[PDB]
Structure formats: C-alpha cells, structure tokens
Design a protein around this ligand. Structure first.
Ligand SMILES: *[C@@H]1O[C@H](CO)[C@@H](O[C@@H]2O[C@H](CO)[C@@H](O[C@@H]3O[C@H](CO)[C@@H](O)[C@H](O)[C@@H]3O)[C@H](O)[C@H]2NC(C)=O)[C@H](O)[C@H]1NC(C)=O
Length: 267
C-alpha cells in the first residue's frame, strides 16, 4: 500500500470542522463530541480491489465510541464489509468487530482483541475483495476470510459497486460491555487518526456499474484464489487466542452452521 493525501480519494460528508488536516492531508483526525461525530467517504465506487487505511484509535477513555471503516453499496439489498472498533474505559482493551452483509442481510459478527495497543501507533487495516473471497487484514495478519460460496447457495458481494466509508460516533447503547459502560462526555473530544488512504480498485460507476479491466487485475490472479498455509495458521491463531465472539461457532443463534465456515477456517 502506497500513502497518498486524503483529498485525492476521499471527501468529508458530515461536520467538516471535526476533521482536522495535517501535513497536506497526509494525516487526518476525526473528532467526536456530545453534539456530533463525523465521517467521510470515497469519491469513487469500486467493484473488487485492495482497500487499506492506517489508523490509530481513540486514546485514554474511549468507552461508548465506535470508529468504523467499511465498504458499502447504496441500493436496497445492499452489500457491506465492516471493521468497527469499540472503545473502552482507560487501560481496558478495544474490540475489533467485523461483519459482512450480502443482499441486505448481515448478522455475521466476529469480535477480536488485538495483539498490540491500537491507540499507541498507526496500524494497517485492509480488505482484499475479489471474485473468490474477501480477506480482512490487520497489518499482514488475516483475521477473517469470507469465501465466494455461490455454488452452495450463499450470497457474496459480487455485482454492486461499493464506496469506502469511515466515521466516528457514539454508540452508548451497545459498544462497551454490551452497553453497560456509557460515554464520559467530559473526556471529549474523542480523536481517531488516519493515514495512507490507499485505494487500488476496479472503478465502476453506480450508473455504468462495471469496470473494463475486470478479471485481469493483479487480485484476479491465481495466487489470490485462496490464502496459503502460513496465512491460514496466522488466522487459526487469531481464532484460538484473540477471538471473543464468532457467529460461525455460535450454535445458539446459528443451529445450522453458516455454509461458509469450513472453507474460511472460522470453525
Ligand atoms: C472492555 O473491557 C472489559 C474488561 O473491563 C472487557 O470485558 C470482558 O470481556 C471478556 C471477553 O469477552 C470477558 O471474558 C470472558 O468471559 C467469558 C465468560 O463470560 C469466558 O468464557 C472467557 O474465557 C473470558 O473470561 C470478561 O468477562 C469481560 N469482563 C467484564 C468486566 O465485562 C471488554 O471486552 C472490553 N471491550 C469492550 C469494547 O467492551
């Protein structure tokens, strides 16, 4: 991933004065207070690609805040690929929640702890999205895989171009300890920081709805049909030691296991 300026790829969409630009827009901060959070979105829409952001999360007390970095399409029956960082009281750990929506249906939450303090330094958070799979990455570690299993009747984000979004907002009702820890507004502003702003994708308008170089990009090559054995072992380590909630192994909500699990090694 190569670092460009914010304004090359992104525009603010709410509370313009709550986004602070540093070094020509090579670093930005989103601020949240009791009146408003803020958010931004990509200028373009994409069908497949590699999307990456360096982020450094809200330090100190971040209880009740959610910082989200996600791709979403725009019509009804929407597709969406989500990172949501759920903050905590001081000295208590963030959760990284992921989710995938297909045809308007989500409910595929997974939640992990991280193997570093996400407030102390910038780390990469990335999505690789091709016709074969979606991989969520934290730096070079795969934390989740969602495979294209249309052959088993399961939906996959396949023909709806998506924009990239990010935002910082309060979510008192559910973010921290299921909603027990409320935001301490005397500790505002809550500040999330961003760099890199990397977009390498198939540009495909909401109107035209397709990209001319499709099937021929570097992420369409055979090396990217699956993770290799080393990447799968990293993933299983995330699964075994860092995972606190997984919809795949949740048999109370999902009596009939999600067809994708065995392929994705979420089991
Ligand atoms: C914010 O910090 C709190 C701690 O202050 C975190 O809450 C803790 O979450 C862990 C992981 O879910 C819980 O531990 C687990 O409990 C289950 C049984 O309930 C057990 O099977 C596991 O082996 C493990 O012990 C822990 O009980 C819980 N503690 C409290 C006080 O609620 C929380 O995850 C942090 N993150 C957020 C965003 O809330």
């Amino acid at each position: 991933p190569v670092d460009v300026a914010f304004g090359r790829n992104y525009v603010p969409t709410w509370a313009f004065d709550h986004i602070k630009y540093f070094n020509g827009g090579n670093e930005i901060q989103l601020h949240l207070d009791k009146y408003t959070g803020t958010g931004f979105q990509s200028k373009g829409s994409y069908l497949f690609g590699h999307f990456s952001m360096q982020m450094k999360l809200v330090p100190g007390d971040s209880a009740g805040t959610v910082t989200a970095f996600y791709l979403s399409s725009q019509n009804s029956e929407h597709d969406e690929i989500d990172f949501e960082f759920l903050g905590n009281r001081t000295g208590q750990p963030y959760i990284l929640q992921t989710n995938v929506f297909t045809g308007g249906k989500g409910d595929r939450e997974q939640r992990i702890y991280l193997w570093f303090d996400p407030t102390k330094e910038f780390h990469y958070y990335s999505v690789l999205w091709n016709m074969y799979m979606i991989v969520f990455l934290v730096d070079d570690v795969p934390i989740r895989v969602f495979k294209n299993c249309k052959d088993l009747g399961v939906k996959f984000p396949f023909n709806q171009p998506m924009k990239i979004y990010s935002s910082l907002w309060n979510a008192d009702d559910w973010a921290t300890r299921g909603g027990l820890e409320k935001t301490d507004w005397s500790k505002a502003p809550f500040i999330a920081s961003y760099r890199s702003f990397h977009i390498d994708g198939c540009e495909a308008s909401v109107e035209a709805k397709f990209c001319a170089t499709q099937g021929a990009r570097w992420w369409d090559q055979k090396e990217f049909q699956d993770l290799d054995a080393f990447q799968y072992r990293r993933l299983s380590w995330v699964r075994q030691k860092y995972t606190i909630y997984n919809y795949c192994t949740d048999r109370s909500r999902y009596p009939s296991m999600p067809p994708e699990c065995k392929r994705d090694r979420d089991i």
